[PDB]
Every structure is written in structure tokens, then in C-alpha cells.
């Protein structure tokens, strides 16, 4: 999955998240078209109670069915402040997309972090099942100790997501930030 | 909520600044393609589509023509809408298609076999958006990607690393894929030039004939044959029947800020709004980033959301999603009241919520 954001001179905004699902999808190119084919079918619940590649589970609602669109977690998002487009964001990450984007919103609104600060800040995540509070490096040992004492099952794992965001000032100035988690990414304007 | 910060000189992390237009993406080349489109007079949608086609060439890991996704569009005038171009399961797909003879899911079938694919929606979605909200013709926004495929580009660290790490597991196992991404028996390395002649032809035909080339033309034929010859399900009928769908965004209000995101078939919008509704009951600013309490509150709130996700979320054209109840502030309040800042509740004690009183 990959996400990108765009804001033009007129103030129009677009947030796009699209994917083949896993990296390179099935790895299958469709004949001589040069087009790689997605493995999005894994987003359906294959059987009630059995997790898919992201540890997500389902039942009837997300069961496989003809012509049905498998449930996604993709969240291209736009936040409005004082009636104007203010934050344009999104990110890849399968089940973690929801929490990654949530943190971008909380970091911006509650913690008053600029878009770059919010982007570079560490992330944590809990998806009910499995029952573990996943964290990236970056949190204080003192803080993790308190969380474990509260009963959280802290698990240090690999970096999560790749936010590509744009914050819009009320005066029209654009502020952007590419995730440090993705080498070779870029946010640029004119 | 406290005052916002767009960034100052004293900060550790500094945002990129621009006065006119801006593009943020996972790939430098694609980002520059988008910026160039804006400079040429295209609007946000024009640039977004151009970036989407460019990534389909420079970021084969996820950028694509053979997958699907979502687009959120907000006009300068406030009009906010969502474009659903999520893949549709083939007409021949069945509930237990991924179960083995013993009735247990086979992840190989749903991840690496020809049965793992849904009918691609990206081309349809981009055209729906470009035609209605863009200003440039498709051939114009496809041209940058076309040239990158035809003339090639230099493989960077990101692509080289992904080809080696993730590509090695699937790409060399298919002749046509290996012929494009592998070289001299190994994945393309940093510094190598990646030319994609077939993809260039596909792009050229789409630019010339429109999205119909993908869903009814030569490309559709190529996909159908790939499936028919290798136990796949996508047929010409599936491709001809695919449609991107414009849907109403899911949204909420968090401390006076309005948040807009994707509605079903995505669960993103609903759960982000639901969780924010829960958090709104706490003074998050007071706890602060990286505090055990803030993390405790959010981790707990997240549990209830994902539990609900497992039961109530699905394609809205097939199942009725109780989105009103899930994004109801009273429901969120009932959840917030269950959160003990000093003691986490095991997931085993958390089940999908009872939405009746909120419907
Ligand atoms: C990449 O983050 C895609 C995750 C999954 N296929 C979905 O949520 O759509």
C-alpha cells in the first residue's frame, strides 16, 4: 500500500491511498501487459474467527462473496479547522493504517505538533486481536514500564506506516512532511 | 484543544514549505511528476491522477494499475467526496474458496495464487475522478508515467531493497514477472535501469483509448487469459462489469475539528471517528504525547473499535453497516466510561458492542 497527498494553488485537496495489498501483490504480471496483480482477496475473512495476514478477523459481514468488495482499512483523511481544509494525510500499513492516521490527527490537534513533528513521532498500536500493545522504538523505558504495570502487553516491533501529509495554513501557506520510515520519499512544492 | 503549530525555527523537525502547490508521496520521481502537473496548470485531481499513474511505474511495490484503492477529494469550496475504486471479487468467487480440504484457510491461495486477485479498480477510479473533478485529458496525466516506463528510470535504495526482500518471494516464480524485475539471475540492484516496455504499451493504449482499454480492451484480454490459463477467476465479464463508485465520506467532529475519511467498503473512516469520539472524553492535551496515560487511553479505545470492526464492517452494497451507531457520541461515551487509566482490560473480556440503544 502507498499513500500520497496533494493540494493545489486554489486550495483543492486530494488524498489517495491505493495498493496491490502486500508488497508486489501476488507478484504475478498479467500476461504481456506488464501489470502486477493484487492479492486483495486476503482482506476478506476466509473463515469466521481465523485471522488474515494482518491479524484481522471477521464473520458474515466481510465473508467472501461474488462481486463483493473486501473490507479495507485504508484511510485517506482530511481534517478541517475553522471551516478550511487543514490537514491532508493517510498511510499504508494494513490493519495499522487506522491507528497511524489516528495518531497523526491526535498529534496535530491535541499535542499541537507541526506536520513534520507529528510525522517523525513514534507510533504505538493495539488491534484487539492479537492482544498486544505494539510499539516502535522511541518511547521512554519509564513510560513502557508504567504501561506494562497497567496490564498492557507491550511488544517492540518494526516501524509502522508511511505518512505523506500536508498541513494548510489559514493564509494559504502549505506545510508538508514525508515519513522518515520510507527511504527515497519526498514532499515538494512551489 | 490547544493552539496549533505550523512549525517554527526552534523545532527539531521542519516541514517543507510552499506558497502555491504541494505533493507528498513515497517516491521522489512521482512527487516531482505531481508538482510538474500543478505547475502546468492542472488542479489537485489532475496531479493526483498523474502521481497515481507514475507510482504504478516507479513504485511497483504498491503503486499500480492492477490493484485498487480510495480517494478523498475536497474542493476549495468545501465539497468533500470519496471515490471507492476497491477491487470486486470475481463473479465466480465463493465463500469457502480459500479453505483447504480440511476446511482450514490456505494463505497461499489468498496471497500468492491466481485466486488471490480481485478485479482491479485503479484505472476506473482515476478516470471517474479525472472526468468529473479534473481538468486535463487522460493522455496528458498518463504521459509522465508512460515515458518512465518506456525510457526507464534508475533503481533507488527503496526499490532495490524491496525487490530483494519482498520481491524474491514471488517475482521470480512467474516468467513474465521475472523477465521484468530480475536481471542476471538476481533482483535489479541500485543503480540499474528499470525499463518496462509492456507496461509502457499498456499505458499508451489507456492514454489513447481511455479506461475502456483496461476493462474491455487488450489489457482486459491479457488479464483474462492470465487467469484462464492459471486457475484464476477474473473473466472479461468481471472486468466489463467493474465500476468505481462515488460515495459519501464518513465524518465526525473532534473538539471542533471536522474529520473526513473513507466510508465502507473501508473501515478506516468509521473507526477513526469512533476512536476520536472516545478520546474526546479525555483531556488528551493534559496527558501529552508519549505519556503512559495517553497511550493507555488510546490502546483501550482501539480495542473496542477493532472488536466492532470484526463484526459490523463489510461492503455496504451487500451488508447494512451500522455506521450511525458506531460513530454515535453516546456509544463512544459508554466505551470511554469503561476505560480505566490504571488498568487495561484483556481483549478476552471485550466483544463487539451492543448497538441497539444507539440505532
Ligand atoms: C496496505 O496497507 C493495504 C492494506 C489492506 N490491503 C487494506 O486495508 O486494504
XYZ file of C-alpha atoms and ligand atoms in Angstrom:
558
model
C 0.000 0.000 0.000
C 1.053 3.596 -0.547
C -0.486 6.978 0.240
C 0.032 10.404 -1.285
C -1.457 13.851 -0.713
C -1.928 16.856 -2.988
C -3.019 20.469 -2.501
C -3.111 22.941 -5.393
C -2.841 26.729 -5.695
C -6.629 27.103 -5.496
C -6.878 25.238 -2.216
C -8.260 21.995 -3.644
C -7.043 18.879 -1.816
C -6.809 15.188 -2.662
C -5.717 12.236 -0.521
C -5.099 8.900 -2.235
C -4.311 5.506 -0.735
C -4.123 2.590 -3.158
C -2.484 -0.809 -3.183
C -1.830 -4.321 -4.529
C -2.232 -5.304 -0.853
C 1.075 -6.950 0.113
C 4.358 -5.778 -1.441
C 4.192 -6.514 -5.185
C 0.866 -8.217 -4.524
C 0.810 -11.783 -5.873
C 3.972 -10.979 -7.793
C 2.058 -12.108 -10.869
C 2.125 -9.971 -14.006
C -0.933 -10.264 -16.249
C 0.431 -11.722 -19.475
C 2.296 -9.225 -21.639
C 0.627 -6.215 -20.003
C 3.462 -5.605 -17.549
C 0.829 -5.112 -14.828
C 1.297 -6.750 -11.408
C -1.823 -8.346 -9.931
C -3.164 -7.637 -6.427
C -3.758 -10.196 -3.678
C -6.610 -8.155 -2.186
C -8.788 -11.243 -1.704
C -6.917 -11.914 1.550
C -8.726 -8.893 3.009
C -11.940 -10.933 3.087
C -12.498 -13.190 6.091
C -11.640 -16.666 4.740
C -13.363 -18.330 7.685
C -15.025 -16.874 10.800
C -12.502 -16.417 13.603
C -9.348 -17.073 11.583
C -7.015 -14.062 11.160
C -5.664 -12.902 7.804
C -2.152 -11.632 7.061
C -2.699 -8.535 9.240
C -4.201 -10.417 12.164
C -7.684 -9.136 11.353
C -10.733 -11.362 11.768
C -14.313 -11.339 10.560
C -17.521 -13.256 10.032
C -20.568 -12.815 7.806
C -20.186 -9.102 7.035
C -16.725 -9.489 5.494
C -17.091 -13.033 4.141
C -16.015 -13.749 0.564
C -18.810 -13.300 -1.946
C -19.127 -12.790 -5.712
C -18.726 -9.169 -6.862
C -18.125 -8.133 -3.259
C -15.506 -5.568 -2.252
C -13.276 -6.906 0.540
C -13.130 -4.761 3.670
C -10.223 -2.319 3.764
C -8.504 -0.277 6.470
C -7.226 2.401 4.077
C -7.886 5.858 5.416
C -7.077 8.831 3.183
C -8.127 11.616 5.557
C -8.763 15.357 5.642
C -9.204 17.409 8.802
C -10.988 20.765 8.725
C -10.114 23.663 11.032
C -12.113 26.903 11.175
C -14.064 25.793 8.124
C -10.983 25.267 5.965
C -9.016 22.246 4.783
C -6.236 21.979 7.364
C -4.624 18.523 7.355
C -4.407 16.081 4.452
C -2.953 12.720 5.407
C -3.051 8.955 5.126
C -0.771 5.939 5.215
C -0.200 2.279 4.300
C 0.084 -0.388 6.999
C -2.774 -2.842 6.656
C -4.562 -3.035 9.998
C -2.227 -0.349 11.368
C -3.463 2.334 8.948
C -6.318 3.225 11.286
C -4.074 3.830 14.288
C -1.305 5.514 12.300
C -3.725 8.073 10.852
C -5.425 8.431 14.241
C -2.067 9.384 15.768
C -1.439 11.969 13.045
C -4.772 13.573 13.951
C -4.187 13.416 17.716
C -0.611 14.690 17.366
C -1.830 17.666 15.337
C -4.911 18.598 17.346
C -4.168 17.533 20.915
C -0.393 17.861 21.048
C -0.036 20.866 18.739
C 2.797 19.310 16.740
C 3.697 20.715 13.327
C 3.193 18.264 10.457
C 6.855 17.184 10.444
C 6.954 16.690 14.228
C 3.753 14.640 14.062
C 5.201 12.569 11.222
C 8.520 11.782 12.917
C 6.990 10.961 16.301
C 6.968 7.297 17.415
C 3.834 5.169 16.985
C 2.013 2.526 19.020
C -0.877 0.257 18.104
C -3.423 -2.180 19.511
C -5.883 -4.050 17.306
C -7.753 -6.082 19.936
C -6.579 -9.373 18.420
C -3.814 -10.206 18.960
C -3.882 -8.762 22.478
C -0.633 -6.799 22.424
C 0.254 -3.110 22.570
C 2.655 -2.805 19.646
C 5.236 -0.016 19.845
C 8.066 1.343 17.716
C 11.380 2.374 19.236
C 11.125 5.868 20.685
C 9.098 5.572 23.870
C 10.633 6.082 27.302
C 11.586 2.972 29.292
C 9.887 4.688 32.228
C 6.688 5.036 30.214
C 6.749 1.463 28.916
C 7.265 0.271 32.498
C 4.114 2.123 33.590
C 2.146 0.684 30.663
C 3.186 -2.867 31.499
C 2.224 -2.167 35.114
C -1.224 -1.123 33.885
C -1.554 -4.542 32.288
C -0.632 -3.699 28.705
C 1.332 -6.368 26.848
C 3.991 -4.148 25.265
C 5.683 -5.538 22.155
C 8.527 -3.711 20.411
C 8.214 -4.256 16.665
C 9.161 -2.882 13.242
C 8.349 0.655 12.087
C 4.707 1.230 11.159
C 3.435 3.163 8.153
C 4.481 5.869 5.735
C 2.512 9.069 6.218
C 2.685 11.640 3.416
C 0.931 14.730 4.715
C 0.199 18.394 4.083
C -0.983 20.957 6.629
C -2.613 24.104 5.261
C -2.235 27.437 6.993
C -5.277 29.748 7.106
C -3.235 32.157 4.976
C -2.681 29.535 2.285
C 0.885 28.562 3.183
C 1.464 24.832 2.699
C 3.495 22.720 5.128
C 4.412 19.152 4.260
C 6.203 16.110 5.590
C 7.265 12.752 4.210
C 7.683 9.821 6.589
C 11.294 9.081 7.587
C 10.284 5.410 7.632
C 10.372 5.314 3.816
C 13.727 5.892 2.121
C 13.593 7.903 -1.122
C 10.230 9.517 -0.397
C 9.629 13.227 -0.913
C 7.341 16.151 -0.230
C 7.884 19.123 -2.521
C 6.037 22.132 -3.842
C 6.434 25.525 -5.459
C -7.924 21.587 22.113
C -4.749 23.720 22.407
C -3.357 26.094 19.769
C -1.958 24.526 16.604
C 1.644 24.819 15.405
C 2.640 25.015 11.744
C 6.277 24.897 12.796
C 8.922 27.362 13.968
C 12.707 27.742 13.724
C 13.301 26.196 17.167
C 11.693 22.858 16.247
C 13.686 19.664 15.710
C 11.633 18.568 12.710
C 10.813 21.089 9.997
C 8.060 20.822 7.408
C 8.719 21.516 3.735
C 7.126 24.868 2.861
C 5.443 26.094 -0.318
C 3.198 29.016 -1.195
C 1.336 27.608 -4.196
C 1.078 23.834 -4.554
C 2.419 20.734 -2.853
C 2.643 16.966 -3.298
C 3.682 14.397 -0.704
C 4.395 10.822 -1.795
C 6.552 7.779 -1.093
C 8.631 8.371 -4.248
C 10.725 11.385 -5.290
C 10.087 10.886 -9.014
C 6.321 10.552 -8.577
C 6.245 13.609 -6.319
C 8.092 15.638 -8.943
C 5.644 14.422 -11.604
C 2.776 15.725 -9.487
C 4.461 19.067 -8.862
C 5.133 19.467 -12.585
C 1.464 18.838 -13.377
C 0.451 21.544 -10.906
C 2.993 23.931 -12.417
C 1.479 23.196 -15.827
C -1.925 24.314 -14.582
C -3.515 21.039 -13.527
C -5.613 21.013 -10.361
C -5.210 18.721 -7.347
C -7.160 15.911 -9.015
C -5.138 16.174 -12.243
C -1.887 15.965 -10.273
C -3.234 13.186 -8.047
C -4.077 11.037 -11.069
C -0.693 11.774 -12.659
C 1.047 10.770 -9.427
C -1.045 7.606 -9.299
C -0.010 6.581 -12.790
C 3.627 7.479 -12.138
C 3.769 5.369 -8.960
C 2.329 2.463 -10.964
C 5.661 2.589 -12.796
C 8.219 3.789 -10.225
C 6.797 2.057 -7.147
C 5.629 -1.389 -8.355
C 5.593 -2.467 -4.700
C 2.297 -0.630 -4.207
C 1.724 1.917 -6.984
C -0.404 0.060 -9.511
C -2.837 -0.463 -12.368
C -3.572 -3.990 -11.149
C -4.878 -3.192 -7.682
C -7.292 -0.750 -6.099
C -7.822 1.955 -3.537
C -9.654 5.025 -2.319
C -9.569 8.761 -2.970
C -10.784 11.604 -0.773
C -11.443 14.867 -2.600
C -12.217 18.230 -1.021
C -12.791 21.216 -3.271
C -11.722 24.707 -2.309
C -15.456 25.360 -1.926
C -15.816 22.700 0.769
C -17.419 19.927 -1.287
C -15.990 16.708 0.181
C -16.414 13.344 -1.512
C -14.994 9.819 -1.582
C -14.140 7.640 -4.565
C -14.306 3.891 -3.984
C -12.165 2.016 -6.509
C -11.683 -1.090 -4.394
C -11.404 -4.391 -6.252
C -14.529 -6.505 -6.655
C -14.301 -10.243 -6.066
C -14.841 -12.230 -9.288
C -18.404 -13.288 -10.094
C -17.236 -16.887 -9.639
C -15.836 -16.234 -6.159
C -17.345 -18.302 -3.337
C -17.451 -18.037 0.463
C -15.172 -21.031 1.123
C -12.860 -20.659 -1.889
C -9.756 -20.300 0.296
C -10.355 -23.310 2.533
C -8.342 -26.495 2.059
C -9.850 -29.990 2.040
C -9.898 -29.913 5.849
C -11.798 -26.632 5.975
C -8.846 -24.520 7.086
C -7.869 -21.285 5.300
C -4.932 -21.658 2.900
C -2.991 -18.375 2.960
C -1.123 -19.409 -0.191
C -4.351 -19.359 -2.193
C -5.367 -15.933 -0.896
C -1.899 -14.373 -1.147
C 0.210 -15.958 -3.894
C -2.100 -17.890 -6.241
C -4.083 -16.524 -9.183
C -7.146 -16.875 -6.932
C -5.788 -14.129 -4.669
C -6.723 -11.351 -7.101
C -9.801 -9.165 -7.174
C -10.916 -7.253 -10.282
C -8.661 -4.122 -10.416
C -10.300 -0.752 -9.845
C -7.451 1.766 -10.028
C -7.850 2.728 -13.705
C -11.629 3.048 -13.292
C -11.265 5.114 -10.135
C -8.741 7.528 -11.604
C -10.892 8.145 -14.683
C -14.058 8.649 -12.638
C -12.223 11.306 -10.632
C -10.398 12.893 -13.569
C -13.528 13.086 -15.722
C -15.665 14.715 -13.038
C -13.240 16.690 -10.878
C -10.133 17.104 -13.021
C -9.423 19.453 -15.925
C -6.845 17.628 -18.061
C -7.397 14.803 -20.567
C -6.252 11.329 -19.512
C -3.447 11.138 -22.091
C -1.879 14.245 -20.521
C -1.748 12.892 -16.968
C -0.623 9.449 -18.156
C 2.244 10.737 -20.332
C 4.766 11.178 -17.481
C 4.284 7.570 -16.352
C 4.374 6.390 -19.965
C 7.822 7.898 -20.528
C 9.147 6.482 -17.254
C 8.013 3.019 -18.338
C 9.258 3.358 -21.917
C 12.596 5.090 -21.269
C 13.136 3.669 -17.795
C 14.395 5.102 -14.516
C 17.225 4.366 -12.096
C 16.513 1.802 -9.377
C 16.997 3.501 -5.994
C 17.533 2.093 -2.484
C 13.835 1.650 -1.734
C 13.047 -0.331 -4.881
C 16.268 -2.366 -4.834
C 15.716 -3.314 -1.185
C 12.058 -4.211 -1.681
C 12.824 -6.297 -4.784
C 15.378 -8.247 -2.758
C 13.384 -8.573 0.471
C 9.778 -8.963 -0.686
C 10.145 -9.461 -4.424
C 12.301 -12.571 -4.064
C 9.339 -14.399 -2.539
C 7.033 -14.052 -5.543
C 8.516 -12.297 -8.591
C 10.996 -14.945 -9.753
C 8.233 -17.566 -9.548
C 6.447 -16.224 -12.635
C 8.169 -15.997 -16.020
C 6.725 -12.671 -17.144
C 7.393 -11.043 -13.762
C 10.955 -12.362 -13.606
C 11.644 -11.048 -17.119
C 10.863 -7.526 -15.950
C 12.165 -7.257 -12.385
C 15.022 -9.778 -12.320
C 18.360 -9.444 -14.117
C 21.236 -11.899 -14.485
C 19.520 -14.217 -12.003
C 19.115 -11.626 -9.256
C 16.715 -8.796 -8.446
C 17.588 -5.463 -10.056
C 20.163 -3.637 -7.918
C 20.541 0.038 -7.008
C 21.880 1.963 -9.982
C 20.339 -0.417 -12.521
C 17.851 0.966 -15.029
C 14.350 -0.484 -14.977
C 12.582 -0.306 -18.335
C 9.031 -1.657 -18.554
C 8.137 -1.905 -22.240
C 4.943 -3.905 -21.773
C 3.647 -1.549 -19.091
C 4.534 1.320 -21.421
C 2.339 -0.217 -24.125
C -0.494 -0.673 -21.618
C -0.173 2.967 -20.549
C -0.048 4.213 -24.146
C -3.205 2.284 -25.052
C -5.016 3.601 -21.978
C -3.986 7.154 -22.848
C -5.206 6.654 -26.411
C -8.395 4.654 -25.831
C -9.391 5.621 -22.301
C -10.159 3.335 -19.316
C -12.085 1.027 -21.663
C -8.707 -0.315 -22.801
C -8.204 -1.775 -19.328
C -11.728 -3.106 -18.775
C -12.787 -4.125 -22.286
C -9.688 -3.832 -24.462
C -6.376 -5.610 -24.976
C -5.405 -5.284 -21.308
C -8.657 -6.934 -20.219
C -7.852 -9.739 -22.653
C -4.366 -10.147 -21.178
C -5.733 -10.315 -17.633
C -8.492 -12.772 -18.563
C -6.038 -15.061 -20.357
C -3.570 -14.912 -17.468
C -6.401 -16.097 -15.222
C -7.905 -18.707 -17.548
C -4.525 -20.358 -18.152
C -3.526 -20.471 -14.487
C -6.637 -21.309 -12.480
C -7.674 -17.703 -11.931
C -11.251 -16.419 -11.790
C -11.259 -12.902 -13.260
C -13.052 -13.011 -16.616
C -13.784 -10.490 -19.351
C -17.280 -10.227 -17.854
C -15.873 -9.304 -14.434
C -13.710 -6.600 -15.976
C -16.574 -5.243 -18.082
C -18.796 -5.156 -15.000
C -16.357 -3.344 -12.719
C -17.270 0.156 -11.618
C -15.674 2.720 -9.332
C -18.249 4.261 -7.006
C -18.511 7.772 -5.623
C -19.679 7.532 -2.006
C -20.425 9.921 0.848
C -17.416 10.273 3.167
C -17.686 9.126 6.771
C -17.052 12.065 9.077
C -17.126 13.299 12.639
C -16.278 16.244 14.863
C -13.329 16.169 17.274
C -13.025 19.178 19.589
C -14.412 21.455 16.879
C -12.379 19.989 14.023
C -14.273 18.009 11.391
C -12.620 14.798 10.230
C -13.448 13.269 6.845
C -12.359 9.811 5.758
C -13.319 6.695 3.811
C -16.716 5.015 4.306
C -17.413 1.309 3.720
C -16.034 -0.753 1.869
C -13.359 0.765 4.093
C -13.426 0.559 7.887
C -10.952 3.410 8.248
C -13.323 6.357 8.451
C -15.731 4.736 10.882
C -13.116 3.587 13.383
C -11.026 6.765 13.256
C -14.186 8.769 14.012
C -15.306 6.237 16.633
C -11.951 6.298 18.420
C -11.739 10.098 18.255
C -15.248 10.211 19.741
C -13.992 8.060 22.621
C -10.829 10.131 23.139
C -12.800 13.386 23.100
C -13.995 12.449 26.593
C -10.444 12.706 27.925
C -8.125 15.713 28.259
C -5.527 14.274 25.879
C -3.541 17.512 25.753
C -3.044 17.363 29.520
C -1.554 13.856 29.398
C 0.637 14.653 26.416
C 2.468 12.674 23.765
C 4.445 9.661 24.933
C 2.741 9.585 28.332
C 1.692 6.209 29.732
C -1.797 7.584 30.382
C -2.360 8.908 26.853
C -1.159 5.615 25.383
C -3.261 3.623 27.852
C -6.406 5.548 26.928
C -5.849 5.162 23.193
C -4.827 1.498 23.348
C -8.021 0.723 25.265
C -10.208 2.756 22.903
C -8.619 0.952 19.964
C -9.569 -2.456 21.371
C -13.308 -1.744 21.269
C -13.052 -0.326 17.751
C -11.295 -3.364 16.296
C -13.728 -5.671 18.094
C -16.583 -3.809 16.397
C -14.684 -3.916 13.106
C -14.655 -7.727 13.155
C -18.445 -7.877 13.377
C -20.074 -4.860 11.726
C -17.853 -3.895 8.796
C -18.217 -5.052 5.207
C -19.139 -3.994 1.667
C -22.196 -1.725 2.185
C -23.704 -2.891 -1.104
C -24.023 -6.359 0.453
C -24.472 -5.778 4.181
C -26.022 -2.995 6.235
C -23.232 -1.330 8.205
C -24.453 0.377 11.406
C -22.222 3.397 10.782
C -24.529 5.821 12.591
C -24.347 3.819 15.811
C -20.611 3.198 15.509
C -19.943 6.931 15.126
C -22.512 7.949 17.754
C -21.028 10.021 20.601
C -23.264 8.423 23.237
C -21.956 4.994 22.203
C -18.420 6.384 22.370
C -19.163 7.729 25.845
C -20.305 4.285 27.007
C -16.928 2.967 25.868
C -14.922 5.782 27.435
C -16.608 5.047 30.767
C -15.198 1.504 30.635
C -11.626 2.759 30.264
C -9.564 2.502 33.454
C -6.442 4.649 33.055
C -4.668 2.455 35.605
C -5.754 -0.990 34.417
C -6.068 -2.419 30.913
C -8.986 -4.702 30.057
C -7.939 -8.014 28.450
C -9.184 -8.390 24.878
C -10.794 -11.634 26.037
C -13.250 -9.514 28.036
C -14.070 -7.318 25.045
C -16.714 -8.231 22.460
C -18.400 -6.252 19.665
C -20.607 -3.620 21.268
C -24.384 -3.803 21.569
C -25.530 -1.061 19.187
C -29.309 -1.373 19.646
C -29.689 1.571 22.067
C -27.857 3.797 19.579
C -29.865 2.926 16.468
C -1.750 -1.697 2.573
O -1.646 -1.004 3.708
C -3.148 -2.400 2.248
C -3.890 -2.980 3.436
C -5.137 -3.791 3.073
N -4.996 -4.400 1.751
C -6.379 -2.908 3.157
O -6.636 -2.384 4.261
O -6.887 -2.525 2.084
